[PDB]
Design a protein around this ligand. Structure first.
Ligand SMILES: N[C@@H](CCC(=O)N[C@@H](CS)C(=O)NCC(=O)O)C(=O)O
Ligand SMILES: N[C@@H](CCC(=O)N[C@@H](CS)C(=O)NCC(=O)O)C(=O)O
Ligand SMILES: [Zn+2]
Ligand SMILES: [Zn+2]
Ligand SMILES: [Zn+2]
Ligand SMILES: [Zn+2]
Ligand SMILES: [Zn+2]
Ligand SMILES: [Zn+2]
Ligand SMILES: [Zn+2]
Ligand SMILES: [Zn+2]
Lengths: 318, 318
């Protein structure tokens, strides 16, 4: 079987929680593959070609990185109930972007303060904690994101939570845009879920009762039905599979060349905010919102690795 | 008279256009004070204490910097029609933030390309153009914002414009959240207005007919009624006036000390994204969303300079 949805993630990851909750909302069964929290990730690299962030979605030999894109893929498969109401398209898109960048960075900083950090690392060996701290520092080497100072983090949280509370207090809708959550609900949710996990500093949430109630409604979607799969099993599946763009049916798909890179061009794709690890391959998938690069790994053969455009940089190799 | 609304701005400034359009929407008469496009600004510094960005709103001896805060002040004065519908509070706040940062930075980069830049500088002396280029480079010295590379700028614009077009094409509402514009409409608008001004590259807008129609509806609000005032007249007015926090009525206003800086503390306030010029004074105004610092200038006496919290950093002087 090479059409199962295989999510590569770990339990304590907020961005992984976002994807798992969306899976619940879509009532989409999936396979669960645990990845390491820190480098190195030798069972991950043959799939992603260097991208080390979590989570990513594997379907056969197609590897979809970033939750903004994973959500779009899941929407493609089960469009109902939708994450992207047409009548809220721009507002939901922009709010989700802000939530998954600026808001998340404030939550990370807020939780990174001494009491918060102590709460997060509570049941873990001191070896791992030190390595985690070093791993995340190296992760910030190339970018601009995920380095909001504590005082600005606190203000962004206080200001935003009050606006969130105000909106919900009107009692007009149970989610941000109506009686169904949108992508923006999920993006905001995991940032706040991360704070809730930082037990010693979670009190900031409790000062906002309506926000807490909304979180409870979001949590109710669950994570659908999952079964574990080993990292090795996932690699075998990618190896046996042919990427969609290389099948006779998928090869005729429209290729957006307006961006000035023709099909087949050797490129790299890299995140721009942090973890700026370049992934190299041939540009074989190009849409308005996303790209896909064909690469060849000795252990999985050919895979195509997909990224959204926003938050990433595509450059010609030369 | 020391209760007129005095906007310090210049014609070609997108952020100034945002404030002027909001003034039209509120039907709020104002006084117009032209400031220089580039440094130095000796008629501005006695008011702002170092903040060199445009626009700012003066009311007597209170100086309100940043359009996010100017909008809140204008809302305080004419709350109807509102910019901040309670039932859309968080969505409008977040979307406006994203529009006034990420989206604006993509528009700036997009317009900064050779043909775009040529269009913008068309009727201007080559002296000024060179100085402008140097001025804006020095402006980016301390921050992270306003440096989106052209290819990423193009993708952010294409992706967002399609979502905007999709939302409007449903025909459900004439503005982003209903039959009245919100703060988010104004924030998105000026970024696109800036692109429209870059004649040679404005065609990107025309590929999105519904977005163009929405821009036309926004433009219709006009700029209310304005009269010119000289920079010197504005300085005299600040000089004669007493800041609200120093009046008997305003002195009892609630002071938010939860952020850990008591009233009277000597601080600096500085933008975090670009133009990171620190403004020093005593912290005498503190709310959840904003701060105000009392300073003394030999030429205007005491003024209080106000900033929003989000996008700024407040630090104790020592
Ligand atoms: N924009 C990315 C952000 C992903 C992200 O930052 N994930 C965190 C985990 S919560 C991460 O990658 N940490 C480094 C790692 O997993 O090795 C997305 O939406 O998927
Ligand atoms: N966040 C600020 C941004 C203001 C801004 O960047 N203004 C531009 C003018 S369009 C600027 O300050 N350029 C430098 C200058 O005016 O000297 C706001 O919303 O007011
Ligand atoms: Zn994480
Ligand atoms: Zn969970
Ligand atoms: Zn299904
Ligand atoms: Zn097994
Ligand atoms: Zn400008
Ligand atoms: Zn105008
Ligand atoms: Zn009035
Ligand atoms: Zn006069």
């Amino acid at each position: 079987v090479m059409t199962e949805l295989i999510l590569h993630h770990y339990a304590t990851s907020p961005f992984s929680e976002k994807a798992r909750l969306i899976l619940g909302y879509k009532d989409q069964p999936w396979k669960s593959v645990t990845v390491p929290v820190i480098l190195p990730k030798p069972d991950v690299m043959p799939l992603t070609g260097g991208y080390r962030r979590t989570p990513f979605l594997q379907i056969g030999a197609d590897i979809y990185c970033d939750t903004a894109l994973i959500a779009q893929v899941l929407e493609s498969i089960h469009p109902v109930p939708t994450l992207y109401p047409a009548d809220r398209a721009a507002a939901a898109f922009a709010m989700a972007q802000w939530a998954d960048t600026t808001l998340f960075w404030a939550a990370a900083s807020f939780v990174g303060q001494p009491e918060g950090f102590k709460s997060l690392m509570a049941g873990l060996p001191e070896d791992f904690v030190k390595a985690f701290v070093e791993d995340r520092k190296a992760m910030r080497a190339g970018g601009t994101g995920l380095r909001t100072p504590l005082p600005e983090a606190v203000a962004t949280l206080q200001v935003f939570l009050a606006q969130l509370e105000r909106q919900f207090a009107t009692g007009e809708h149970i989610f941000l845009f109506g009686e169904q959550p949108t992508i923006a609900d999920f993006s905001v949710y995991h940032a706040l879920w991360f704070i809730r996990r930082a037990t010693a500093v979670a009190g900031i949430l409790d000062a906002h009762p309506e926000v807490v109630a909304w979180m409870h409604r979001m949590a109710g979607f669950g994570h659908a039905q999952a079964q574990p799969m080993t990292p090795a099993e996932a690699l075998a599946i990618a190896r046996a599979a042919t990427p969609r763009a290389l099948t006779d049916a998928g090869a005729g798909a429209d290729f957006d060349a307006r961006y000035g890179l023709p099909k087949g061009t050797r490129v790299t794709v890299a995140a721009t905010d942090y973890a700026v690890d370049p992934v190299e391959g041939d540009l074989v998938v190009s849409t308005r919102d996303a790209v896909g690069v064909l690469r060849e790994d000795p252990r999985v053969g050919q895979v195509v690795v997909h990224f959204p455009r926003v938050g990433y940089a595509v450059r010609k190799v030369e």
